[PDB]
Structures are given as structure tokens and as C-alpha cells.
Subunit: 334 residues, 3 copies
């Protein structure tokens, strides 16, 4: 009975960070309370000024990551301010029943709702908006994120030995379908409603115009690169609510990877590239061994370099000549 | 020696049902006899009346599912009536040699053939037509289905504990390539032969016009929704003979999933979305816990909602507030 | 300390062969030395005479396979002759640091470099060229191959029992993006530089014009078919540096498959079709049981038969009626 449990209240943080949480814990089950507020807004998604008539949880693409433990109950207040134009809801893949909770959270602008469900399965799970008749549009316009349900005793390798991360990052990858006009330039829409018909037409081609991490080409580069140090273990959460992707860390590996994202299954080790099925979130651990700037990208290299599915990780620490050494620098052929 | 074994004769049933069979069995190996008759026919594949010049095993897309046990011999009589226009054959991925049996089953209209092979590997396996020089066309036009080879002692979890289903369903997903004329409307062809050249051109683009479960948009919805009750375990067999797909049960999970479809491998648990590689069949078990109407769909949501890769499962039983509860219904923001 | 180890020198061989090597070995770690020389060249890629302004390691698509053992150090001299027009480098997914070694191997025409890295993880790993600002183009133009790092004690099944192959083949699958002119014919370019802008435009559509094994439609067919005998175990290495593919052996299986390509993970058995993620190499073992001509192909059958992703394996030996028997040849319907 969930009514007998202590409630806790979690404050969410914006991607690529994930809110403070314990991995292995001595705590018994709780009702963990969250709130998210929907924001529709026009966003600039590339270097040339293309806009998207976007829809978001909490103002960001992806929505923030929610973290609980197996056996906890997730209790979400979903808010849809009167300043929004469309109805919304939420479908938690981590949840059982009522189309993931969509049927119980249909909120018009000016309304809110509170859903509770038992997080009875460990893993990273997609959540997304799913209003009847407009599901793909709300999803591709930005309305998805990840629920991470940790096992109560933390992550385990295939032999049941403990695994941990020192730092977690959350990456949402968005296949975007931005329409063009007769002049071949991308269209700019005054309102969200006006983008709809043209966007569906692009969607039906199955060819994205852009594929971006965290809402924009270069979102996770420069000042906004992810960070780590040699000897630190990072968890990279990767969600793709609509389309397949193949994450890869250049100069690195997936040390332990749950590509289907479900922690009761043994992870695979030493991966070069893994696979996130459209409509899922996966998770990879990597312990840095070399300093420098790494790229974390979709290894369809066109989707990465041409369409935008690539970020950077800047890693501090000491170079290791045993792992890699330039024996002879570039020089004239003898 | 297969010649020493008892023969049995199985009557096939139309998808989404699967013919009666045992899971774990005390029976020794048999020669299990089946017959299928090819039918070419024009089919209506969507709500607006688009037609496909279709080719089928037994009149349905997919063909019926054949069920045997590991160590059985499958003995198929393939019939190609004189009323058909094209030659056909059959390639069983569950079989060893002779291009899956295609080289031994080439049947012109007015002909038939009988193939036997040993079902020596457990799993769900694609079978499809594969005539020399026209393989993709016959496959994308509807000529595929599943052979399920059960382990003699039934299904097992990763720890070797017994698993079972109470009810099995078979879903074939078909990427269709319907041509358009200068007016942008889909073409309607008088004969199967006349659809050929235009269809190959669409195929080479790799963009399906439609992606359907079981031959038609909405095939598994309304009166034709799949059914179950709370507490019942369903096996969902999903075949895709030509293209990748990513099955998902909305409000549910894959409790135990063999996404590559081969039962001697441990299944994965708690999946949100799994992956069926083009040219394969996979299998998922789910035990219902909540009543209501679920969607079972390809989680490329464009492929599902726009192109047709989605069905429904209507589930009877009692709602469970512990698993999910609407705490506060939609109501004005305070 | 790698400086204390014996060096060995390996002579590479052209695909589809793989250079002689030991599987399980009593040898301790070595510095294994290789050399590759880059060659840009126009290649004919199909039956109708289409050309590609290609870029290669060692003159072939894919580059040759490099084989070492876990704990060895790979020491590559990369040569870029003055007869080439572009700068190049190499990114080993099998390596740790410096963007796979790309940052340490930037070679202009007339230059060379020597990189060493520790092959500390078992598996088949992609290597590819990756010059800053032109990564996808160099990769899709042909600059990838496989590093195989064998476990020192050879391959193992999920129970830790020994596995082996008698013969290894390496297949690189290349999604090509050949431009067309106003007349709808493929363009022929005088130089590599002139192909660039048009090619990027085709690439951004994500639709390949051709998808080929080993540089050309039909590369592994006729005189060039792969070969084996009944009772022989073959290792099929399959690399795809940019795009997903789904290998299948028609009339056969993947007996033991590492589809993510990393040997410290248990392989799956009995696969009909497996999955190579773009930006990875995978490996399958199969022991032939029937003689004849098999097809080894991408099981998107359009990508195989229409676009070129298919080869042949000619297998010698004695037919086995127990595995498969034509009971009644094609004959009039009674
Ligand atoms: Cu919404
Ligand atoms: Cu969903
Ligand atoms: Cu046919
Ligand atoms: Cu096949
Ligand atoms: Cu290059
Ligand atoms: Cu790479
Ligand atoms: Zn740590
Ligand atoms: Zn049951
Ligand atoms: Zn052998």
C-alpha cells in the first residue's frame, strides 16, 4: 500500500545534468513527488537560424531526467499553463496501465493533473507526450525525456559485482522535420498551430532535416561540452523517443552498456557503438583513461556531422603512453 | 532417420491466431505435415481505398504461423494454383540447405511441391517466397510468415526456469511501396504484372508508402483488436521479412523478450521497446496486470500513426491502484 | 611497458581474405607492426559502369583486416603518398585516446606517421579515416576496415567452452552516395575534389544510390564467390562504418554470433539474421552442413538485390537428406 509510505520531494535540474540521487541505498520505498510544467516555444535549432515550433517538458529538450529506485512510486504533477495553445499529457514507458498514464493526464491549457505509478522495473525508460490524434507531432517537437529507475542495491555487472558512476549525463536525440518553402529555405511559423500540416508532410517522408542532441546543433560543444577527469566513471543516458540511433564515444568505449536500457539484464562490455531503438532510453558506463576532447555521437556519420547528432566531452588528467603513443609524428616519406 | 517417425497433420489457422499446439511436450519427434496454397490478389490496404497487387501464402498477410518442436521435421506441400500468374517457392530461415528450400520448391501456376526439412533449432523464424530475380518484390508484396520451433521442454528464462504463454498472437509487419501517378494519387493496377516496374522504382527509394500490420491500416483494431484478460500471459510473435521495426506495448512491457527470436538464448526482461531486424521474427511474453485498451505498435511513431504500423489489444479485468492511480484528475491550475 | 616487448611484423592481405594468424596462442604480448598506404582512385562500382571517386586504405574497399591478440600493442605506419590529393588519418575504435588515434596520424600527401596503441579489449573493431571537417565523406568514399583483437586463449561460447574457425572472411559493406545530373544519369568526376559538393548533397538525403560488399555490386560472386566445404567452420567478419545492416546467410545460420562484435560477451546462437550497427564490426561463426551456393546478404532485400549488398559462398561436400529432402519435385496439381 503506497498510502503507508513516506513521501519525498525532488527538485529537477535541466539536462545534460541529472538531479542528485543515491545509487545503492539503504532507504525503503517512497512516494517520490515531481512537478513538470509544459512550455511551447519557438527555438533556434541550428547555426543558420532555423527555428522549430517546439513543445517541451520544463522548457528543455529533452525534458529533465527523473530518478527513483525500484519499488518507489513516482508521483508527477503535470502542469499545462494557460499560455500554451495545445492539450498535452504524459506516457511513462516505466509505468503499467492506462497507455503509460496518458489517459489519466490529459491537460488543456490552464489545467493540471497528478499521476502516481509504481516504478516496479529497473532501467532507463522514455516518457513522452501522447495526445490522441497528434502523438508523433508532440514527440518529434520535443516532448520526451527519461525516467531512470535504479535497482535499490545499485548497478551490477553480469557476474553480479557492483558497478557505479561518479557522474551522470542525459542526452536526448531529436529527429526534426522542418518544412521548406518553394525557395528551398526553411519555413518560420508565427504560431505552433501553423507549423502542423507542413510538418506532417515532412514527417511522412521519414527523412529528418536535422538530428540534434539536446535541442540544437552543437548543444553539447564549446562552453557547453560535457566534462570529466581521467579515473572518473560517467553514466551516459541516451534517449530517442521516435527513431533509432547508434551512440559512440570517439577514442573511448562503452565499458558496460545496457543498450535496451533495462538494469535487470546483464550489460555488454567493450562496445565501440551501441544501439538505442526508437522509443527507448539506454545507458552506458565509461571510465576515462586519457585526457582530451572526445566526441560522443550517433555513428551514422552523416546524421552526426551533417545533421547535428554530435557533442563533445572535455576530459582533464594525465596522458598515458602505454595506452597510446605517437611513435613518429607526421613527417616526409623517406 | 525421419522415415522411421510417426507423421502428424496440422490444420493451419489465419493470423493473428496461431494453430493449437503444445509448449512443453512428452511427445518424441514427428514428421509434421502442412499445406499452403498461394493466392495472388488485389487488396485494399488503407482507409482511403488504396490497393496493393498482393501475393500471399494461404490468402493472408502474413502467411499463417507454423508451429513444431525442436527435432521435428517440417513437411510442407506448397501449392501454386493455375489461377495465379507468377511462379513462386519458399525459403525457410528455420531450414538448412538449398537456399532455405527455395531451390527445391519452384512452382509454376498449376504445379505443387513437397519439401521436408529438420527443424533442428529453436526459435521463431521467417519463411518467405524467393523466386530468382524477383525476391524483394514477392516478399514486399506479402509473401512471408513465421515458423515457430518450440523447445521440446518449452520456453525457459535466463536461469533455466519454465516460462509459458496462455495465448499466442502473430503479427506480420509489411513495408509497402505503392506507386503514384503524375496527379500524386496512388496507382490502381489491373494485373499483378503491370504493378511491377513502377513498384521497383518506389522500392529503390527505400521509403515505404505504408507500413501495415497484417495486410492493412487498422487490421488489428476495432472488431479485430487482439484480446486478453488481466493475469493472462500472451506471446506476441512479430515478423518483418524486409525491414527493421521496433515493437512496443503502450502501458505495458516485454516481460521476457527474444528480439532476435532464438529460444536457446536467454531472453531479456522488462523491455520498453525491442528490435526486430529486417529478415527475422522475434517473440515477447507479457502478463497483463491492468485492464483497458493497449496499443501494440512500431515505436517509430511516424511509421505507426502516419504509415499504419499499430494495432490494439483489449484487456478485461480489474484495475490495480497500486500499479497506477490518478491522484488528482485534470482540473484548473490553483 | 611496451618498450620491453618483442616486435613482430605482419604482412597484410587483401579482402575478403584475412592474413594468417593464430587463434588460441601460447605467445606472450608483442608489439605487432603493420603498414598501410592510402590510395585515392576512381573505381567502377556497378554493372552499368558507374564510378566512385574513392578513397582507400591499401587500394581496397574495405581496408585489410588487422589481427592481433588482447594485450598486444598495434603499431601502424600510415603512409599518404604525394600522388594523393587529400589529407588523411586513422581512428581505431579498438584504441583508447586521441579520437582513436586520428589526432596523432594527420598525414598530408607526401607524409607518413607511426601510431602505437594497446589492444586491451577483445573483438572486431572498425577503423576509419576521420579528417577534421570531412569525416563522413572520407568514410563513405571507402576508408574503413576492421581490427580483430582475439582473446589470447581464443574464442569461447556462453559456457566458456572453446570455439574456433577454420577459415575467416572479411566483408565491408559500403553505403554509397553517387550524384546524378539533370539527365538522371550518374555523374563521372575528373578529380576527387570535384565530386565533393554534389556528394554531400546526396549524403544529406540519407538514401544511398548503391550499397555494396567489398567495393562493387557482385564483388563476392562468380569467380570471386567465397568458398568452403561441408564440416568447415567459417568466421564472417562484417564491418559497416556508417550505416546499419542486417547480415543473413540463406540456407544457413549464425551458429555463434557477436553482433556488437566484442568477444568478452557471450555470443548468441542459431540466428537467422543479425544486426551490425553503423560504426561497428561484428562476427559470426557458421559450420557448413550442406553443399551448394549460398547467398550472404543484407536482409533488407531491396538493399541486397536492388542496391548491391549481397555475395555468394560456394560450398563443396555431400548433401544431407536428413537435414533437407525434396519429397515431391514440382509437378502438376492432382
Ligand atoms: Cu504534448
Ligand atoms: Cu511511447
Ligand atoms: Cu512468390
Ligand atoms: Cu530470407
Ligand atoms: Cu581520408
Ligand atoms: Cu568511428
Ligand atoms: Zn568511480
Ligand atoms: Zn499463464
Ligand atoms: Zn573446425
Amino acid at each position: 500500500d503506497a498510502d503507508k509510505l513516506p513521501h519525498t520531494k525532488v527538485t529537477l535540474v535541466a539536462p545534460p545534468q541529472v538531479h542528485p540521487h543515491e545509487q545503492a541505498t539503504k532507504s525503503g520505498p517512497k512516494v517520490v513527488e515531481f512537478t513538470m510544467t509544459i512550455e511551447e516555444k519557438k527555438m533556434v535549432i541550428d547555426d543558420k537560424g532555423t527555428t522549430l515550433q517546439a513543445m517541451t517538458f520544463n522548457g528543455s529538450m529533452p525534458g529533465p531526467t527523473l530518478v527513483v529506485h525500484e519499488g518507489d512510486y513516482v508521483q508527477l504533477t503535470l502542469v499545462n499553463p494557460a499560455t500554451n495553445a495545445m492539450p498535452h499529457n504524459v506516457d511513462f514507458h516505466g509505468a503499467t496501465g492506462a497507455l503509460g498514464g496518458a489517459k489519466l493526464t490529459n491537460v488543456n491549457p490552464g489545467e493540471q493533473a497528478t499521476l502516481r505509478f509504481k516504478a516496479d522495473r529497473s532501467g532507463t525508460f522514455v516518457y513522452h507526450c501522447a495526445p490522441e490524434g497528434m502523438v508523433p507531432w508532440h514527440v518529434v517537437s520535443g516532448m520526451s525525456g527519461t525516467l531512470m529507475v535504479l535497482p535499490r542495491d545499485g548497478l551490477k555487472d553480469p557476474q553480479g559485482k557492483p558497478l557505479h558512476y561518479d557522474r551522470a549525463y542525459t542526452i536526448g536525440e531529436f529527429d526534426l522535420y522542418i518544412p521548406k518553402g518553394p525557395d528551398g529555405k526553411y519555413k518560420d511559423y508565427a504560431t505552433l498551430a501553423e507549423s502542423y500540416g507542413d510538418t506532417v508532410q515532412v514527417m511522412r517522408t521519414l527523412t529528418p532535416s536535422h538530428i540534434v542532441f539536446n535541442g540544437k546543433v552543437g548543444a553539447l560543444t564549446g562552453a557547453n561540452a560535457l566534462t570529466a577527469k581521467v579515473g572518473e566513471t560517467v553514466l551516459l543516458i541516451h534517449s530517442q523517443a521516435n527513431r533509432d540511433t547508434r551512440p559512440h564515444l570517439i577514442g573511448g568505449h562503452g565499458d558496460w552498456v545496457w543498450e535496451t536500457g533495462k538494469f535487470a539484464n546483464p550489460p555488454q562490455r567493450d562496445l565501440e557503438t551501441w544501439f538505442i531503438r526508437g522509443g527507448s532510453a539506454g545507458a552506458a558506463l565509461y571510465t576515462f583513461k586519457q585526457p582530451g576532447v572526445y566526441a560522443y555521437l550517433n555513428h551514422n556519420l552523416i546524421e552526426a556531422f551533417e545533421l547535428g547528432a554530435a557533442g563533445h566531452i572535455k576530459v582533464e588528467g594525465k596522458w598515458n603512453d602505454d595506452l597510446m603513443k605517437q611513435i613518429k609524428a607526421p613527417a616526409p616519406i623517406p
